[PDB]
Each structure stands twice: as structure tokens, then as C-alpha cells.
Amino acid sequence: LIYTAGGYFRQSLSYLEAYNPSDGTWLRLADLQVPRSGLAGCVVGGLLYAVGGRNNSPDGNTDSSALDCYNPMTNQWSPCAPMSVPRNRIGVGVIDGHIYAVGGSHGCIHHNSVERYEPERDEWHLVAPMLTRRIGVGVAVLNRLLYAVGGFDGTNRLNSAECYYPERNEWRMITAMNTIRSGAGVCVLHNCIYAAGGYDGQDQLNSVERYDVATATWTFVAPMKHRRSALGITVHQGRIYVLGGYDGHTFLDSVECYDPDTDTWSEVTRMTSGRSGVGVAVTMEPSR
């Protein structure tokens, strides 16, 4: 199932909902312990992690360093050790069962710091910082290398991308994207990095481009039907899914699906309510 956690819809949300592309249903599961937007989601050992974000509440507005773990067999949330700093609009990737938290903002601070979480010791450790300060950064893992793509450094929005080598603990600039994108959806489908949508400081985008390591080249593909920034993205059964986002007017509930064989996008469902800044990931059904 495609799990969506958190998000924003005039205030941060606590929703955890799970979509079934066969069933078309949305399953309502345990609420997050704290409402959060600008977070990221991932899966390690079948467990669904919610990372970073921010609590935008009618009574406060605090960035989040929290890491929380959801178990679909118990349908329950459990807190993990937090990151060194709060990271709103974070990017995350998974290498060797370790969670890399990348960039994000804390108030006025735009991080280049990166840290790594070990699920089997509940510990975080800081790694080498990025060459760039990046919030709204897309993160993807390809051949066990970490890619930070696009974002916002506090002054300019970025089309640049860089690659982290875990065992040499350093970052290396790579070829830049064709388009400046902050808050894009960045995933890995088959053997290519995908960057879809985002915001370039003027317009929300529907364009989609994919990076081939063998050519070190970004190439456009079919654009989505709806321009959207701060969208959720994931890969389910060899197809790309993008969820919600903001198009300058509305927080979208549209969910689009990209088939690479056809190079076509299609709307497959609506979320129960429009939202942006969700964390999205795929893991097994719940139980009981």
C-alpha cells in the first residue's frame, strides 16, 4: 500500500492514510502523534518512518527534529531518537538500511548538514554536509549512492544536484537539472532518478525529467497533468505515484500515476482531502 503521512491544509495534519491501487480504497490508520507538514517518509525493515517536518498549529509553529516509526502489524506509532536539529521540508534516502536526513530548514537556518540514523541502535550521527544549503530538496538513492536534487538555499532556488558517497563520506556535484526545482518529487524508478514538478520562484511546474547515471544526463519525459509543488512521490509496482501538492491556488488531492513503458501520466484517485508537504512510502498492508 501507498502510505501518506502528515501534510498541510491550512494547518499541519496528523493523517496516516494508505491507498490500494487495486482496491482504489484509502485506509485510515493511526494518527501521527504530532501533526506535521514538510516531513518525509520512508521504509526500513517493513517499518514506516516519518522524519522531520513542522507543526503549524493555531497555537504555535515549531519545526520538528522528530523521527517516528509506524508498524502496520500493530497499526501503531512509536517514537525514535530525534535528529540533531529540526528539519522542515527535509529530504531522506535509505542506504543499507540506514536513513539519511538531508537539508531542511530550522527557522531562518537553511541546512547543508546531513545525518544518518541506524535503526538497530536508535542513533543518529552527523555525516559530511552538502556543498549547498538545500530546503525543499529531493533525495534519491541509486546504486547505494545518495542524490540531493534541487531545493532552496535561502536566496536562490536550485537546479543543481550533488551525490554523496557513503564510504568516502563526501559530496560531489553532478550535472544540473534542466529546470530549477524546489519542493519537487524526486524518486528512483528502474535505473533513473526522477524529478517531477516543484517550484522555480515564479511558477509551479508540471514538467518531469529523469537523470541517467550512465550518460550523466537529465532528459525530459511526459509532464504531469497538474502543476504542483510540495508533492508527495513514491514508486509502487514499477510505476510512479505523485500525491497532492500546491498549485499556487489549491492544495491538491489529485493523485497521478506515471507508466514508464507508455511515458504517460494518469489520474488514478483523489486523496480524502487536499494537502501538500506529505511524507509518502510503500510497505505491506496493515493486519487484524
Q: Which domain holds residue 205?
A: 1-288
Resolution stated for this PDB structure, in Å: 2.4
Residue 99, judged by CB atoms within 10 A of its CB (0-12, 13-18, 19+), counts as buried
How many Cα atoms sit within 13 Å of 176 on the Cβ side? 11
Buried b or exposed e, range 220-243, using 16+ CB within 10 angstroms: ebeebebbbbbbbbbbbeebbbbb
Distance CA 114, CA 84 (A): 10
Q: What are the grid coordinates assigned to 117, written together?
A: 540514523
DSSP string across 128-196: PPPSS--BS-EEEEETTEEEEE--B-SS-B---EEEEETTTTEEEEEPPPSS--BS-EEEEETTEEEEE
CB neighbours of 33 closer than 8 A, spacing ≥ 6? Answer: 14, 68, 77, 79
Cell readout for 153 is 538555499
- Does residue 12 sit in helix, strand or coil? strand
Grid cell in block for residue 280: 509518502
DSSP E strands, 6-57: 16-19, 26-28, 40-44, 47-51, 54-57
Q: How far apart are CA 285 and CA 152, in angstroms?
A: 35
- Structural domain count of the chain: 1
The number of angstroms, rounded, from the C-alpha of 268 to the middle of its chain's C-alpha atoms is 20
